[PDB]
Amino acid sequence: LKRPIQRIVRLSEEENNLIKRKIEESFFPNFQNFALHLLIQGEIRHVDYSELNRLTTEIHKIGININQMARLANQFHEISSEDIKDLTDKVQSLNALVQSELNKL
Amino acid sequence: LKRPIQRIVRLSEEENNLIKRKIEESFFPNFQNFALHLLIQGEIRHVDYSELNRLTTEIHKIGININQMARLANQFHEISSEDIKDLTDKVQSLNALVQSELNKLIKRKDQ
């Protein structure tokens, strides 16, 4: 025999009905030929979001500044109106760093 | 019995050896889980959202710190109640951007 190896795929009733539609929408007449082609041609794709790593790292160091401001405000229980608008500026600068490093992509 | 239907695929030894190498290259343990996904979806895509969640988690942390600050600032009459508002708006205006603009990225990656 040309193909003596037999592999089984087990299916639910709905999964089987999906398979039937895919066969009909395919170029192939029957399951054997549909499945053979797709198992051989289907290529696994790996996808990650490492292109954001540069942006994540620049946000992070803004983070550590805002973080130490917060630790200090909490240990001295004081905050000034100058600290508030200074925060606001750091916030609108994060808004800039985000649109910028994301258009770059 | 969750899966009471079986379909059979016949292979040559060389086609079967090719499929084994593919199953090893995927995140699926065995032929069942590999075929089921590939025959119904038509592709296998392993997506790692790790770096994207590291981004949104950092933005979340900054938001916590800012809220701690704004809240405290309510204890001081010299700090305008409507200048704390102007800091809290710009944090939600940044969350908005981060979320939408990152969905535009997840679409340009699911293609």
Numbering used by the authors:
A (entry chain C): 7 to 111
B (entry chain A): 7 to 117
Sentences from the paper on this structure:
PcfF-oriT complexes, however, recruit PcfG to form the relaxosome, as evidenced by supershifting of PcfF-oriT complexes in the presence of PcfG to higher molecular mass complexes in electrophoretic mobility shift assay (EMSA) experiments. Here, we have solved the structure of the accessory factor PcfF, which binds the pCF10 oriT sequence and recruits the PcfG relaxase for relaxosome assembly.
Crystals belonged to space group P21 and contained 4 molecules in the asymmetric unit. PcfF crystallized as a tetramer (dimer of dimers in a head to toe organization). However, the tetrameric interface is weak and deemed unstable by PISA calculations. The biologically relevant oligomer was suggested to be dimeric, in agreement with results from the SEC and GEMMA experiments. PcfF contains a RHH domain at the N terminus and a 2-helix bundle, here termed the stalk domain, at the C terminus. These two domains are connected by a hinge region. We gained evidence that this patch mediates binding of PcfF to PcfG by showing that a single point mutation (I70S) abolishes PcfF-PcfG binding.
